[PDB]
Amino acid sequence: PVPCGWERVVKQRLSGKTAGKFDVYFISPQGLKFRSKRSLANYLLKNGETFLKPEDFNFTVLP
DNA sequence: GTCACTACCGGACA
DNA sequence: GTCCGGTAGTGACT
Structure with missing residues (x-):
């Protein structure tokens, strides 16, 4: 649902015209932020x- | 047109 | 990182 390695952040506005x-x-897994x-x-x-690769395992x- | 809603991105912040 | 605003876009319509 949220693709592996990615993070989803939700916030709600508190004040001003757009409150609520x-x-x-x-x-992204590399720390890139996307707001749209x-x-x-x-x-x-x-991207x-x-x-x-086999070397990833x-x-x-x-010892 | 207005109204209500969504979506994108910018600027302020010290 | 935090926070909300300005703007453009969609679609129904007394």
């Missing part, structure tokens, strides 16, 4: 893929 409104943003679906969708175009028990 909500703001949502996402933090538009900017996140732009980023995702070339949405994650890849894996440790099958050994240390």
Whole structure:
């Protein structure tokens, strides 16, 4: 629901004209912050893929 | 047009 | 990091 490694933050406004409104943003696994679906969708175009190699997996028990 | 609502991004903050 | 505002966009409509 929130993709693996990402974080979702929800906040509610307290004062002023827009009191009660909500703001949502996402933090990526590298700490990039996205406050809009538009900017996140732009980023995702070339940067949405994650890849894996055999070297990412440790099958050994240390001495 | 107005009204109500959503969405995006900017600036203030010291 | 915190916080709300200004602006543009959508869509129904007495």
